[PDB]
């Protein structure tokens, strides 16, 4: 009903997501620009971790 | 037997902290039903977004395509044109060589008759000379005509170098438009093949665009709608507004859902603590309590 | 204590599946540096690939031109041979003409006279050699003058054809240097990209190690990965709050 | 705009080809033929006259205007070949240092917006050829303009450098030229004569008194300069006018 309608985008709300310039935008020949040091991930910190599980395994031969 | 109802005081506080997390856990189906029970949206924003902009794409790439093909039209007119402006050419090159040849051959003739004069002088002066060993009339004509023939040869110098300036001049124009056709092919490749390349991505966004329907996220569709259609609003409605008024609350449609989702799955996590028995342990307490006064 | 350390343990197996999924992490991560680094050098080797094409392309051009100078040095001398020989047949075809001309100036003469009638025939007799000699020289003459100036022509079309392949060669030269520069860039980049990988990896062996991880089996989706850091990172602050101290300051105790 | 011809494009290497193989047709063989035509008819008709005849002033005169005209007319043809030369090296420089069309500059010279060179309108711009820096002075228009009065009397003072009027003032005193040596009692069969001397000698006796030194002063007098065997040039001018004295004598 109601709901529905409102959850629902009707395609003619907007213009269709039209981009901007007629055309796509020029690029540099090579461009490379490789980057992405990181994916996703990120997060919690992996040094404190490393040293929770470098701790873990001097426990683990603690508890024996 | 004080001590066991110490004790089940004690656990009175887990049984309402297991009971409290059974409710949550109802309320986490609850939102994920309000998003399960209806069109997941996430999903729909997602398709509605991914469709919207693979539809402008491929408007943006059909309308450049038909601007290039209405386009293309006018250069296979300029390659007719330069084509006949290149016969042009051909008659301009020949008719050139015909006047450079005529000129070289009236030239050659033009020399060729001031040496026949030359020996019918010589031959003149011999018959002078033997005779000497009419005739100046003989050698006054001839050298009238001599005189005439180097007028006529001056006359035509000049006229040759006329020939050679026109010979040169309306040939610079017609190597203009031979370049003009040699750049037009090139261009007229490189248009075909960009055009071609332009050809190629259209038919590929609308691969992406038929990709983008029929989905199987969409055959997933008009079931959820049957799904929400057996129960139709009652309960179901005032929690559908609730979620809708935190979702706009929150202005956000994604990033939200998911750290609820996240939330109330950690939430979960730490649930059914000691639950097997509830009534028991109350009914047990309430008669030992009861035992307790007699 | 103890049993806040078997506690511990409970959660350091998460704890340590969190840091194998991290590392986990880390690694697809190296491997997707790694295989776009494989990428742009194939990218590198078909544009190295190019730049070869156009260098052998050049190579075989300014062989080209250097044959195509050396005729024209020959050509040339030989054509200044060439204006010698015409130049002599010239004179030799104005020898004959003269020749021709008083003979015949003669004959005339002697015809005129008539107007000696077995002189003037034998004179006749005599005579004609002389005028098929004058026409196969004048024919010779023509002949040669004609292939001089088609030859001249042709050669200085051909040395405006070698300069213009000069020139040409000088632009390909040009698009060789653009594409070396290009090719610099790009190796800048991967030597930029390389630095970053051997940082990541130095990170990976640091945390647990890289090779060691591997071995162990996760979906290579980078979204699913981020998904259960987050899902094992909840499970841990559940396990945190209920332990209530952190867990580093528990072992520290326990120590 | 309008119909997508663009008034002008880069050169290519296909146009370059045509660039290089179009040229102004020469006419340097025909002018020599032409010149060696025109000399040889003024020597045929030095002796072609007779010599009882008189009246050849305005043969002369026609034949020196038709020789003046050839040279106009050569001079033009060398301003027309080092103009095309000109043309040509501009038109190349200028499409060299024009950028090359790929995918949208071939656009924006169809608009106008962008202009490259055109022969034809460089050609049209090109300036009017000039006879300038050309003398028409040469030993067969020097012969022609002098035979008249060699004609009329086989010595005359026709050079008029020192003073526009005449040899001196109003009066030549320059005495006769004789065509019989006093040196060598016989005609001059090879007149020579220098540049720096401006005397002409039979060389029969002149290479004998050069034997043995390698430069001997002039005999004749009015000059004080010394000059080799290689100085010396044929002097048809002494040779017209032995044979004009000798045609003149024998009829």
């Known amino acids: 009903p109601i709901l529905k309608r409102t959850i629902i985008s009707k395609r003619k709300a907007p213009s269709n997501n039209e981009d901007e310039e007629i055309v796509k935008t020029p690029r540099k020949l090579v461009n490379y620009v490789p980057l992405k040091i990181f994916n996703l991930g990120d997060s919690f910190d992996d040094t404190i971790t490393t040293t929770v599980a470098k701790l873990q395994d001097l426990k683990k031969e603690i508890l024996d | 037997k004080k001590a066991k109802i110490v004790h089940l005081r004690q656990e009175s506080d887990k049984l309402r902290k297991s009971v409290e997390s059974l409710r949550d856990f109802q309320n986490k189906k609850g939102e994920i039903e309000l998003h399960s029970q209806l069109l997941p949206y996430v999903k729909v924003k997602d398709h509605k977004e991914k469709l919207n902009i693979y539809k402008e794409e491929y408007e943006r790439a059909k309308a450049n395509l038909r601007a290039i093909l209405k386009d293309k039209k006018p250069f296979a007119n300029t390659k007719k044109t330069l084509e006949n402006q290149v016969e042009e050419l051909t008659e301009k090159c020949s008719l050139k060589t015909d006047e450079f040849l005529k000129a070289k051959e009236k030239i050659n003739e033009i020399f060729e008759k001031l040496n026949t004069i030359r020996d019918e002088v010589i031959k003149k002066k011999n018959q002078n000379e033997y005779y000497r060993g009419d005739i100046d009339d003989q050698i006054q004509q001839l050298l009238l005509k001599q005189r005439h023939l180097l007028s006529k040869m001056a006359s035509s110098m000049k006229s040759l170098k006329n020939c050679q300036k026109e010979l040169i001049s309306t ?4 190597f203009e438009a031979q370049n003009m056709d040699v750049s037009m092919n090139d261009v007229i490749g490189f248009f075909n093949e960009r055009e071609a390349d332009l050809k190629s991505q259209y038919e590929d966004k609308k691969k992406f665009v038929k990709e983008a329907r029929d989905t199987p996220e969409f055959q997933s569709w008009m079931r959820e709608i049957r ?3 057996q129960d139709t609003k009652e309960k179901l409605n005032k929690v559908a507004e609730k979620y809708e008024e935190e979702g706009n609350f929150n202005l956000s449609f994604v990033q939200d859902v998911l750290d609820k989702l996240e939330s109330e799955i950690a939430m979960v996590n730490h649930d059914e603590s000691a639950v097997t028995i509830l009534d028991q342990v109350t009914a047990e307490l309430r008669e030992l309590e009861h ?3 007699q | 204590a103890k049993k806040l350390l078997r506690e511990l343990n409970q959660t350091s197996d998460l704890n340590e599946r969190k840091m194998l999924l991290q590392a986990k992490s880390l690694w697809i991560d190296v491997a997707h540096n790694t295989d776009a680094c494989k990428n742009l050098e194939n990218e590198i080797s078909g544009i190295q690939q190019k730049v070869d094409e156009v260098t052998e392309k050049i190579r075989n051009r300014q062989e080209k031109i250097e044959r195509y100078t050396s005729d024209g040095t020959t050509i040339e001398a030989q054509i200044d041979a060439k204006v010698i020989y015409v130049n002599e047949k010239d004179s030799e075809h104005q020898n004959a003409r003269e020749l021709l001309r008083d003979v015949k100036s003669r004959f005339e003469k002697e015809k005129s006279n008539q107007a000696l009638g077995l002189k003037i025939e034998q004179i006749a007799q005599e005579a004609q050699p002389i005028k098929e000699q004058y026409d196969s020289t004048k024919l010779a003459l023509v002949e040669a003058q004609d292939e001089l100036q088609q030859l001249k022509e042709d050669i200085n079309s051909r040395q405006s054809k070698i300069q213009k392949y000069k020139d040409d060669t000088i632009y390909y030269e040009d698009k060789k240097k653009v594409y070396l520069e290009n090719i610099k860039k790009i190796e800048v980049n991967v030597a930029a990209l390389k630095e970053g990988i051997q940082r990541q990896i130095q990170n990976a062996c640091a945390f647990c190690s890289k090779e060691r991880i591997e071995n162990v089996d996760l979906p290579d989706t980078q979204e699913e990965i981020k998904r259960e850091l987050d899902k094992v990172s909840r499970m841990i602050q559940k396990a945190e709050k209920s332990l209530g101290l952190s867990q580093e300051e528990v072992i520290a105790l326990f120590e | 705009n309008d119909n997508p011809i663009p008034k002008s494009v880069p050169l290519h290497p296909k146009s370059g080809k045509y660039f290089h193989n179009l040229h102004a047709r020469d006419l340097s063989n ?5 010149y060696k035509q025109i000399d040889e008819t003024i020597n045929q008709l030095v002796d072609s006259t007779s010599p009882s005849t008189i009246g050849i002033e305005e043969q002369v005169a026609d034949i020196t205007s038709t020789y003046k005209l050839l040279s106009t007319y050569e001079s033009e043809s060398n301003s027309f070949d080092e103009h095309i030369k000109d043309l040509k090296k501009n038109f190349k420089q200028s499409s060299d240092a024009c950028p090359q069309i790929d995918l949208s500059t071939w656009d924006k010279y169809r608009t106008g917006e962008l202009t490259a060179p055109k022969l034809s309108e460089l050609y049209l711009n090109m300036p009017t050829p000039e006879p300038a820096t050309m003398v028409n002075n040469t030993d067969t228009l020097k012969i022609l303009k002098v035979l008249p009065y060699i004609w009329n009397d086989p ?20 005495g006769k030229i004789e065509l019989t040596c006093p040196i060598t009692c016989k ?9 720096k001397c401006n005397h002409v000698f039979d060389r029969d006796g002149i290479q004998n008194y050069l034997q043995g030194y ?3 002063d002039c005999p004749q007098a009015a000059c004080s300069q010394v000059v080799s065997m290689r100085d010396f040039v044929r002097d048809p001018i002494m040779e017209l006018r032995c044979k004009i004295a000798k045609m003149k004598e024998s009829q």
């Not at chain 4, 010595?155 to 320059?174: F, S, W, Y």
């Open chain 2, 171 to 174: 040939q610079i124009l017609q």
């Open chain 2, 227 to 229: 799904s929400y259609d």
């Open chain 2, 291 to 293: 035992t307790v006064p």
């Open chain 4, 30 to 34: 025909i002018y020599q033929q032409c």
């Open chain 4, 155 to 174: 010595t005359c003072v026709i050079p008029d450098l020192q003073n526009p009027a005449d040899e001196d003032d109003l009066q030549i005193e320059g």
């Open chain 4, 187 to 195: 005609p001059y069969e090879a007149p020579l004569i220098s540049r």
């Open chain 4, 214 to 216: 390698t430069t001997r």
